[PDB]
Write a protein that binds this ligand. Structure first.
Ligand SMILES: CCCCCCCCCCCCCCCCCC(=O)OC[C@H](COP(=O)([O-])OCC(O)COP(=O)([O-])OC[C@@H](COC(=O)CCCCCCCCCCCCCCCCC)OC(=O)CCCCCCCCCCCCCCCCC)OC(=O)CCCCCCCCCCCCCCCCC
Ligand SMILES: CCCCCCCCCCCCCCCCCC(=O)OC[C@H](COP(=O)(O)OCCN)OC(=O)CCCCCCCCCCCCCCCCC
Ligand SMILES: CCCCCCCCCCCCCCCCCC(=O)OC[C@H](COP(=O)(O)OCCN)OC(=O)CCCCCCCCCCCCCCCCC
Ligand SMILES: CCCCCCCCCCCCCCCCCC(=O)OC[C@H](COP(=O)(O)OCCN)OC(=O)CCCCCCCCCCCCCCCCC
Ligand SMILES: CCCCCCCCCCCCCCCCCC(=O)OC[C@H](COP(=O)(O)OCCN)OC(=O)CCCCCCCCCCCCCCCCC
Ligand SMILES: CCCCCCCCCCCCCCCCCC(=O)OC[C@H](COP(=O)(O)OCCN)OC(=O)CCCCCCCCCCCCCCCCC
Ligand SMILES: CCCCCCCCCCCCCCCCCC(=O)OC[C@H](COP(=O)(O)OCCN)OC(=O)CCCCCCCCCCCCCCCCC
Ligand SMILES: CCCCCCCCCCCCCCCCCC(=O)OC[C@H](COP(=O)(O)OCCN)OC(=O)CCCCCCCCCCCCCCCCC
Ligand SMILES: CCCCCCCCCCCCO[C@@H]1O[C@H](CO)[C@@H](O[C@H]2O[C@H](CO)[C@@H](O)[C@H](O)[C@H]2O)[C@H](O)[C@H]1O
Ligand SMILES: CCCCCCCCCCCCO[C@@H]1O[C@H](CO)[C@@H](O[C@H]2O[C@H](CO)[C@@H](O)[C@H](O)[C@H]2O)[C@H](O)[C@H]1O
Ligand SMILES: CCCCCCCCCCCCO[C@@H]1O[C@H](CO)[C@@H](O[C@H]2O[C@H](CO)[C@@H](O)[C@H](O)[C@H]2O)[C@H](O)[C@H]1O
Ligand SMILES: Nc1nc2c(ncn2[C@@H]2O[C@H](COP(=O)(O)OP(=O)(O)OP(=O)(O)O)[C@@H](O)[C@H]2O)c(=O)[nH]1
Ligand SMILES: N=C(N)NC(=N)NCCc1ccc(I)c(Cl)c1
Ligand SMILES: [Mg+2]
Lengths: 140, 98, 52, 320, 113, 347, 48, 83, 63
């Protein structure tokens, strides 16, 4: 994850959007596979095929959320000509939440996901700008 | 490292995967636990013998002593599982889901 | 002191005790008694401390 | 030293106090079958402790000053009311049966505690092992619902498994028509309302279930009405029993110590008699229970732990 | 400082907690509360029953609490001693600054209009 | 079990834990864990029923697996350093294995599945040991190896433990499973602060053990193991409902009660290291713990649930259970906040 | 009232009552003596 | 003594094998402390030279160390030859 | 209370709170330096004790 994460943050906002969508889609697909592995291991599928169906359904859903986010947030930065604005991640975050509602067929999950994915993504850009630490290194 | 360590570390990993991927018999998995102890004994014994760490030569012996206590404990529980259900199948041990 | 009215001294005594403890706190905060620029003066012939 | 693991280690072991005369005898039979008199004579001749049948107010007789409490502190369950209106709408029939089972459970623990701690045997009149005949009779007459029966069985399963059956089960076999005559001569107005079908159900359960069950694990002496009159001949029968069967032969000091730790802790004995299963017959609303519980604490010598009640003459409380 | 020692010998150069320490009084009050809870759970007269038992609750709480406070005070003395000794050993890391008055320091004014 | 045998087995449980805590040699640490595992299994099986057999079997398999991983870490450490001293490990792969092994023994998420099931399957007295005394040995080892622990791994385990512990407790009606999921959540706070200030790990551990012991002792006093059986307590020992309420509020971390002290100090040490997001996330997630603690207080003390007629027979007998140390434990569980600076005794 | 069974705690356990008061007195005397030692030692080390 | 003596004659009649076992184990535990030759066991074990005896640098003031192995100074095994 | 007592009591309070505040800042900067450089009493993680080494002549010379 460390290398796939660096790729995303190492290519500037609005420059090489296609490359950005590769990285976020790659992150989303990895997350979907992890969810599938635990799901398949803890709730055994009725058959081998059904396990593959569940995996491909989670991994695609997760990759779609990652793809729409990384693209939309890059397009917003390019069009708005503001590569440092958290608002772009909010729009990208909400769009991903909307796609999650789409793949789930449920406007309510779509609405809630748009709000919390949008806010969470916006918080991520702010922390990147300001240097917020999630797993802060011990210093004192 | 030297090539022997490749196969001993491989053996430990194979037994570890064997332990973590249950089938039906509880005794099959208890065997994988004894295998894990065997690979640790060999890997510990090689390192200690190669380095001429004289006092550490007793350490592998102590490892086997507590390997047997673990094995005896595992078999004692297998007896009680067998008595309750008539087989040592692990799928019978699911009462504590609720 | 009666068997029927001794409970009516608990709160008055708590006030007296609390009043007393507050004054003892003021005795640990005398580092600037008669030392501030605004109120520093001389002691009257008979006086001991400006405020106790 | 109150009994515990420390007393066990220092030597207080059951096999020291238990002799060939340390037996648990239960006397059973139908209503007005002469159990009480036969039980009292057997106890006196064999030199055992006699336990009069456990009734509604048995528990009062063992705590406090040993006198019956007002009926609100037994749930208001009434045996007289059961005869007058066996199909009462306030669930008296089962509530009484559930209260009586718990009283028997407590008496059995007291009997076992006496037997294990002193070695002197005991004589009971019915027990937890034979209490179900009344429940079966109640259900076949329609006095209680199938759910009451289910609740009774749930409580029995998790309670009767902890104890040992009696060494000797004495049964007095009085046929129903004779019993009806005996109940009729006795005189109390309410018991005269018992129907023969009810008494036949008690008899059918006694012979269809209790005795076949007890036989595999206890010595059973089945007497007729005439044989039972002379308690001396019954005592002679008990004195030459072989005692070759049942779970008592497998008991050791280790097991009887675990049993003693249970029967001496009455709250542990009664633990499952109040399982949270909400049958209307036995469920008490929070407002009623709160009121009754307050009144119970206002009785003489019940506010505090026994020995700390100054209202009834306890002294040295500030050092106790 | 000393390995696996509750009160190293160097701690005796510090004053002991006074027996009228407010923290020790609170600890004693906790012992009193423990005594009352002991009576309550056993349905004994809460205030009156078993005064000897209540006394031992207070005394044992105070006894342990006195040594905890003695060790608590010692460990904070050690923290201060370590910190000041380190400041002496590395002056360049803790320079004494030149202090300027507010007449000299420029602070921006933000009107509340 | 013979009373003397029971005492000897309990002393072997303690000796195994003490061996881990006084050992300077990895082999003796591993021996201590093995000895401890050996003596606790008979305590789990002491009641001999199919659920206790399943509980002990699941415990043995998990603990014995973790011991293999622990011994593997020690041997890797020996190969790359040529010594056995209990301290930082000299190989990052040895540090991962030892950290995962200790997380397994602690039942931290995602290695947590055994804790709810094993606790449910054994008596209350055995569950008390499992959720308190058994945390001491793995924690004492982490306290010594933390300089070489991977920061991302330990904080990932801590976060997952707080979430899963909080979420898992929401769906429980059995008291033992409620305590098990509570324990998983509290383990997360202990190891979250470990990389920053191990002293705060010990304070959290000590305060958690006191509160957990207090709750298990009160459950034992009434022989209650479900929510509903605990709801009859108001109609038997009213004082006990108040003590349960105070402890449950304390365990939720509400001021001015003791259980707020560890959360307070852990937030302080984390913010000093510019860790703001994590302590905020942990504190908000801990509100799940408070939610299902509060549910218990509702059904136990703050309302009066329906009772049964046979309960009246219980009014006539006094509590006979030992309830050892309960008066002291409940006071310490609730009234320690004014003495918080006493945490320096743990330095 | 007058109990049908003699209460376990009907009368004081004087062996216990004596031990409890004796321990309290001993601990208090030990604590006071210890405190005086510390005050005397503290002044000596500090030249007071 | 009678109770123990009566207990001894009983176990001889019933469990002579266990009587011999405890008697034999007892002598194992006791006799090594009472034996006068136990001290030589350590002396012999100490006198067996598995290692080379590395010489000391003659600093000019160790009069009790032999210069040559056949010199008088140093430990001797005359006690061992007469054993 | 007269204004002078309250006024000068406040200065006593301000002095203690100012002294404590400075020490708190010093402690955070001392902790930061001790942890980064390992040169102080705090964050002193143990190394192997050298009194455990045996310096006697061995069975072979080259060691
Ligand atoms: C260094 C290298 C590593 C060292 C190891 C080298 C290899 C040496 C051998 C090691 C021991 C292997 C032990 C295998 C074992 O005992 O498991 C038996 C295990 C249970 O045995 P069983 O009772 O006979 O059940 C048979 C059917 O699986 C029963 O099927 P069903 O009735 O349950 O039908 C539904 C089925 C449907 O299956 C699925 O859903 C598959 C979906 C996959 C998504 C694509 O459900 C599942 O199978 C779910 C489990 C699938 C495995 C988890 C994948 C996630 O069966 C298996 O899972 C087969 C695996 C055999 C190959 C093992 C490969 C080992 C590689 C491990 C990863 C290496 C890491 C490094
Ligand atoms: C849903 C919640 C998942 C959160 C996403 C976690 C993630 O993707 O981060 C990957 C992270 C790489 O970040 P890294 O740079 O290695 O950490 C050092 C920080 N200075 O990988 C890591 O090392 C942290 C592990 C994250 C585990 C997530 C579960
Ligand atoms: C150390 C690094 C580890 C990082 C990842 C840790 C995650 C471990 C989670 C294991 C504990 C939680 C188990 C759980 O959540 O339940 C199993 C869950 C099943 O949920 P599922 O069947 O997919 O939803 C059905 C909807 N009708 O299965 C899941 O889908 C949970 C997936 C969580 C992945 C994160
Ligand atoms: C100067 C002291 C000021 C008080 C400070 C209180 C601080 C909190 C201390 C908590 C510990 C309280 C003591 C433990 C409870 C024991 C009392 C009890 O359980 O029942 C009341 C009992 C009277 O009932 P009874 O059982 O019949 O006994 C007869 C004795 N005459 O006993 C009595 O007769 C009265 C005993 C006192 C009642 C205590 C009631 C509990 C209060 C808890 C509220 C939380 C405390 C307030 C929060 C701020 C803390 C400063
Ligand atoms: C952190 C800051 C705050 C400080 C926290 C400090 C916590 C630790 C301090 C100790 C806390 C426990 C204090 C217990 C006091 C009550 C003891 C008591 O009253 O016992 C009375 C009696 C037994 O007394 P007895 O053992 O015979 O005295 C002779 C001892 N050789 O028999 C009885 O009836 C007592 C029954 C109630 C006891 C509950 C069960 C515990 C058993 C205790 C046994 C005796 C304890 C002696 C305490 C001495 C400690 C110095
Ligand atoms: C000191 C500084 C630190 C500050 C932290 C806070 C300090 C307080 C810590 C509290 C620790 C628990 C000790 C509280 C003692 C409670 C005393 C009490 O409950 O009264 C006794 C009474 C028992 O009833 P009973 O024995 O049957 O007597 C006949 C009356 N029915 O009880 C009852 O009858 C009650 C039965 C009905 C249930 C009512 C429940 C609502 C009242 C709860 C009040 C206590 C809440 C404590 C929580 C902390 C409050 C801040
Ligand atoms: C939702 C709960 C679950 C998820 C956890 C919440 C965490 C996500 C919220 C992010 C808030 C922003 C933030 O975390 O700021 C971090 C910032 C780090 O800056 P720092 O490095 O310490 O200082 C030097 C600056 N270069 O910190 C600082 O600089 C100091 C900031 C002070 C501490 C602020 C605490 C965070 C407040 C976030 C919630 C505020 C909104 C409250 C909502 C109430 C709802 C009713
Ligand atoms: C500081 C915290 C101190 C915690 C004190 C714990 C007191 C627990 C006492 C509960 C009530 C008495 C009791 O019986 O405890 C249960 C258990 C004995 O088992 P029991 O079912 O009662 O009967 C055994 C017969 N087979 O009793 C036991 O075996 C004791 C189990 C608890 C031991 C671990 C306690 C927590 C860690 C203590 C170290 C502190 C750090
Ligand atoms: C910058 C990179 C951004 C990466 C974004 C990552 C987003 C997180 C994705 C996690 C994996 C998806 O998570 C999973 O989605 C599927 C949607 O099909 C949901 O699945 C649910 O919805 C649909 C239909 O109802 C079906 O999949 C399934 O029948 C149902 O269980 C799961 O409840 C959810 O657990
Ligand atoms: C439901 C809510 C759940 C909790 C939500 C919490 C929100 C937390 C927001 C993320 C915090 C900041 O997240 C992280 O910040 C650091 C900066 O310190 C960035 O770090 C980055 O900085 C440089 C440039 O700045 C990059 O070249 C490099 O790839 C990376 O190190 C990360 O790219 C960012 O992901
Ligand atoms: C030569 C001196 C050393 C002699 C040491 C002999 C030690 C022998 C240990 C006992 C071995 C015999 O094994 C068994 O022991 C039990 C007692 O435990 C004996 O049985 C004995 O029990 C108790 C005493 O304990 C007596 O009241 C009983 O009369 C007696 O028979 C049996 O006769 C024997 O079957
Ligand atoms: N519902 C119910 N009534 C019971 C139970 N045990 C006793 N009784 C009643 O209590 C009364 C006394 O029972 P008996 O002892 O058998 O009658 P008796 O007049 O005393 O004749 P003896 O057998 O000699 O003692 C009868 O009315 C019984 O119906 C019971 O378990 N359930
Ligand atoms: N933060 C750490 N991990 N170490 C640590 N406690 N540093 C702070 C130093 C300290 C604090 C209190 C005392 I009392 C003492 Cl003597 C020393
Ligand atoms: Mg009768």
């Amino acid at each position: 994850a460390k290398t796939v994460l660096r790729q995303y943050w190492d290519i500037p906002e609005g420059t090489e959007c296609h490359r950005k969508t590769y990285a976020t889609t790659s992150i989303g697909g990895a997350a979907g596979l992890v969810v599938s592995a635990y799901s398949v291991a803890l709730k055994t599928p009725t058959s081998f095929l059904e396990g593959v169906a569940r995996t491909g359904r989670y991994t695609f859903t997760a990759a779609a959320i990652g793809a729409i986010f990384g693209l939309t947030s890059c397009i917003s930065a390019q069009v708005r000509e503001k590569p440092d604005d958290p608002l772009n991640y909010l729009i990208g975050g909400c769009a991903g939440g909307l796609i999650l509602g789409a793949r789930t067929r449920s406007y309510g999950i779509g609405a809630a996901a748009c709000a919390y994915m949008g806010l969470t993504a916006a918080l991520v850009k702010m922390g990147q700008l300001e240097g917020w630490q999630v797993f802060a290194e011990p210093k004192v | 490292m030297s090539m022997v360590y490749m196969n001993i570390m491989m053996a430990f990993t194979v037994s570890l995967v064997g332990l973590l991927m249950y089938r039906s018999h509880l005794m099959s998995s208890l065997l994988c636990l004894e295998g894990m102890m065997l690979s640790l004994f060999v890997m510990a014994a090689l390192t200690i013998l190669n380095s001429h760490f004289t006092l550490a030569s007793m350490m592998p012996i102590i490892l086997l002593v507590f390997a047997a206590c673990e094995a005896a404990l595992g078999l004692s529980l297998l007896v009680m599982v067998s008595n309750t259900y008539g087989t040592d199948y692990v799928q019978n041990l699911n009462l504590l889901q609720c | 002191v009666v068997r029927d009215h001794w409970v009516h001294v608990l709160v008055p005594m708590g006030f007296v005790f609390g009043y007393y403890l507050d004054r003892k706190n003021d005795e640990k905060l005398t580092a600037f008694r008669n030392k501030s620029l605004l109120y520093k003066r001389e002691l009257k012939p008979n006086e001991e401390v400006t405020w106790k | 030293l109150q009994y515990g693991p420390l007393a066990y280690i220092l030597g207080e072991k059951a096999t020291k106090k238990m002799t060939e005369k340390s037996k648990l005898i239960t006397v059973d039979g139908n209503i007005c079958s002469g159990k009480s008199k036969l039980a009292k004579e057997i106890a006196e001749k064999l030199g055992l402790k006699h336990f009069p049948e456990a009734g509604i107010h048995y528990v009062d007789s063992t705590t406090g000053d040993g006198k019956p409490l007002p009926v609100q502190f037994s749930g208001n369950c009434s045996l007289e009311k059961f005869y007058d209106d066996p199909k009462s709408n306030d669930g008296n029939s089962y509530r009484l049966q559930a209260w009586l089972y718990a009283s028997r459970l407590l008496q059995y623990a007291d009997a076992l505690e006496h037997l294990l701690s002193t070695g002197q045997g005991v004589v009971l009149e019915r027990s937890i092992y034979s209490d179900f005949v009344f429940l079966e009779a109640m259900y076949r007459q329609g006095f209680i619902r199938k759910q009451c029966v289910d609740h009774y069985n749930q409580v029995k399963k998790v309670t009767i498994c902890e104890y040992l059956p009696p060494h000797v089960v004495v049964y007095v076999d009085v046929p129903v028509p004779e019993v009806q005559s005996r109940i009729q001569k006795k005189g109390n107005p309410h018991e005269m309302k018992i129907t023969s079908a009810y008494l036949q159900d008690i008899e059918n359960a006694y012979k269809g279930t209790f005795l076949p069950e007890m036989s595999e694990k206890c010595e059973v002496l089945q007497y007729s009405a005439w044989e039972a009159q002379d308690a001396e001949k019954v005592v002679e029968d008990i004195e030459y029993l072989k005692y070759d069967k049942g779970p008592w032969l497998d008991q050791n000091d280790r097991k009887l110590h675990k049993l003693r730790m249970l029967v001496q802790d009455k709250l542990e004995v009664l633990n499952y008699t109040s399982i949270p299963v909400f049958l209307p017959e036995v469920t008490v609303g929070a407002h009623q229970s709160d009121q009754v519980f307050q009144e119970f604490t206002e009785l003489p010598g019940r506010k505090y732990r026994a020995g700390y009640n100054e209202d009834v003459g306890d002294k040295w409380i500030w050092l106790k | 400082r000393a390995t696996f020692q509750f009160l190293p010998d160097e701690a005796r150069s510090l004053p002991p907690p006074k027996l009228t320490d407010p923290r020790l009084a609170f600890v004693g009050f906790l012992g009193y509360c423990s005594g009352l809870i002991d009576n309550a759970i056993r349905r004994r007269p809460v205030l009156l029953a078993g005064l000897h038992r209540q006394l031992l609750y207070i005394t044992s709480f105070v006894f342990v609490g006195y040594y905890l406070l003695k060790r608590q005070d010692y460990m904070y003395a050690v923290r201060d001693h370590d910190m000041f000794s380190y400041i002496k050993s590395h002056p360049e890391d803790f320079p004494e600054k030149d202090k300027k008055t507010y007449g000299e320091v420029f602070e921006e004014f933000h009107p509340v209009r | 079990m013979n009373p003397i045998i029971f005492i000897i087995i309990l002393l072997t449980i303690m000796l195994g834990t003490i061996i881990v805590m006084i050992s300077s040699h990895w082999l003796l640490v591993w021996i201590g864990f093995e000895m401890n595992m050996l003596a606790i299994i008979p305590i789990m099986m002491k009641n001999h029923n199919p659920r206790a057999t399943e509980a002990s079997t699941k415990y043995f398999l998990t603990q014995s697996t973790a011991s293999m991983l622990l011994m593997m870490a020690v041997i890797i450490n020996l190969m790359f350093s040529g010594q056995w001293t209990v301290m930082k490990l000299f190989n990052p792969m040895a540090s991962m294995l030892m950290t995962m092994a200790l997380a397994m023994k602690l039942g931290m998420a995602p290695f947590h599945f055994w804790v709810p099931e094993v606790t449910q399957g054994i008596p209350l007295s055995s569950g008390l040991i499992l959720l308190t005394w058994q945390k001491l040995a793995p924690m004492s080892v982490l306290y010594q190896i933390f300089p070489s622990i991977n920061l991302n791994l330990i904080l990932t385990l801590s976060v997952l433990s707080i979430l899963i512990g909080g979420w898992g407790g929401l769906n429980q009606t059995q008291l033992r499973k409620i305590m098990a999921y509570s324990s998983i959540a509290h383990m997360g706070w202990m190891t979250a602060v470990l990389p920053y200030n191990p002293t705060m790990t010990l304070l959290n551990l000590i305060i958690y053990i006191i509160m957990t012991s207090t709750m298990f002792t009160m459950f034992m006093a009434n022989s209650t193991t479900t929510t509903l059986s605990l709801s009859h307590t108001w109609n038997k020992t009213p004082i006990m409902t108040v003590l349960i309420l105070a402890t449950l509020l304390s365990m939720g971390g509400l001021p001015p009660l003791s259980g707020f002290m560890p959360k307070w100090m852990i937030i302080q040490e984390m913010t000093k290291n510019n860790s703001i997001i994590l302590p905020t996330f942990m504190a908000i997630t801990a509100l799940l713990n408070l939610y299902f603690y509060m549910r218990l207080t509702y059904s136990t003390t703050l309302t009066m649930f329906p009772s049964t007629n046979n309960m009246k027979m219980k009014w006539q007998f006094p509590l006979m259970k030992k309830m050892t140390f309960l008066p002291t434990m409940v006071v310490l569980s609730t009234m320690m906040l004014p003495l918080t600076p006493m945490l320096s005794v743990l330095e | 009232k007058f109990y049908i069974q003699e209460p376990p705690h009907g009368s004081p356990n004087w062996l216990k009552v004596g031990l409890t008061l004796g321990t309290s007195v001993f601990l208090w005397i030990y604590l006071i003596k210890q405190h005086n030692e510390d005050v005397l030692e503290y002044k000596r080390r500090n030249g007071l | 003594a009678e109770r123990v003596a009566a207990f001894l004659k009983n176990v001889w009649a019933k469990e002579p094998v266990l009587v011999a076992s405890f008697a034999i184990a007892g002598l194992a535990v006791i006799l090594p402390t009472l034996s006068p030759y136990t001290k030589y066991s350590l002396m012999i074990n100490r006198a067996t030279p598995y290692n080379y005896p590395v010489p000391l640098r003659d600093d000019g003031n160790m009069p009790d160390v032999p210069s040559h192995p056949q010199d008088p100074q140093g430990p001797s095994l005359e006690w061992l030859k007469r054993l | 209370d007269g204004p002078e007592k309250n006024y000068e009591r406040t200065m006593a309070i301000l002095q203690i709170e100012a002294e404590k505040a400075e020490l708190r800042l010093k402690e955070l900067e001392v902790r930061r330096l001790m942890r980064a450089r390992g040169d102080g009493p705090w964050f002193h993680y143990p190394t192997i004790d050298k009194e455990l080494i045996d310096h006697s002549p061995k069975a072979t010379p080259d060691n």
